[PDB]
Amino acid sequence: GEVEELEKKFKELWKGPRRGEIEELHKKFHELIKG
Amino acid sequence: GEVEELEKKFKELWKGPRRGEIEELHKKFHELIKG
């Protein structure tokens, strides 16, 4: 197990369950790890 | 199950397994869902 898990949960939440709440979390990830 | 799954896998990959590869994926998420 490496990072393929976080990526799969990503495209799986946009196409399946809700979506607006998912991309909202992505914005949080930008303020979570910065760049 | 809603979005708490993607968030947990997030902070779990930074603090546990590798990390540089995780934040790298986050950049991909920005080009994955745009804003």
Written overview of the protein:
2 copies of one chain form a homodimer. With 35 residues, chain A is mainly alpha-helical. The first copy, chain A, has one domain (4-33). The first copy, chain A, has 2 helices and no strands. Chain A has helices spanning 4-14, 20-33. The first copy, chain A, starts with a helix and ends with a helix. It is classed as de novo protein. Keywords: DE novo design, protein design, protein folding, bisecting U motif, four-helix bundle, helix-turn-helix, DE novo protein.
* Amount of helix of chain A: over 70%
Largest sheet of chain A: none
Number of helices of chain A: 2
**Shape label of chain A:** flat
Q: For the record, give the distance between the C-alpha atoms at the N and C termini of chain A, rounded to a whole number.
A: 24 Å
Please give the radius of gyration of chain A in angstroms: 11 Å
PDB class: de novo protein
Keywords: DE novo design, protein design, protein folding, bisecting U motif, four-helix bundle, helix-turn-helix, DE novo protein
Assembly: dimeric
Entry title: solution structure of alpha2D
What are the salient characteristics of this protein?
homodimer, 35 residues, mainly alpha, 2 helices, 71% helix, 0% strand, flat, de novo protein
Topology of helices and strands:
2 copies of one chain form a homodimer.
Chain A: H1 4-14, H2 20-33
What does this entry show, briefly?
The first copy, chain A, is mostly helical and 35 residues long.
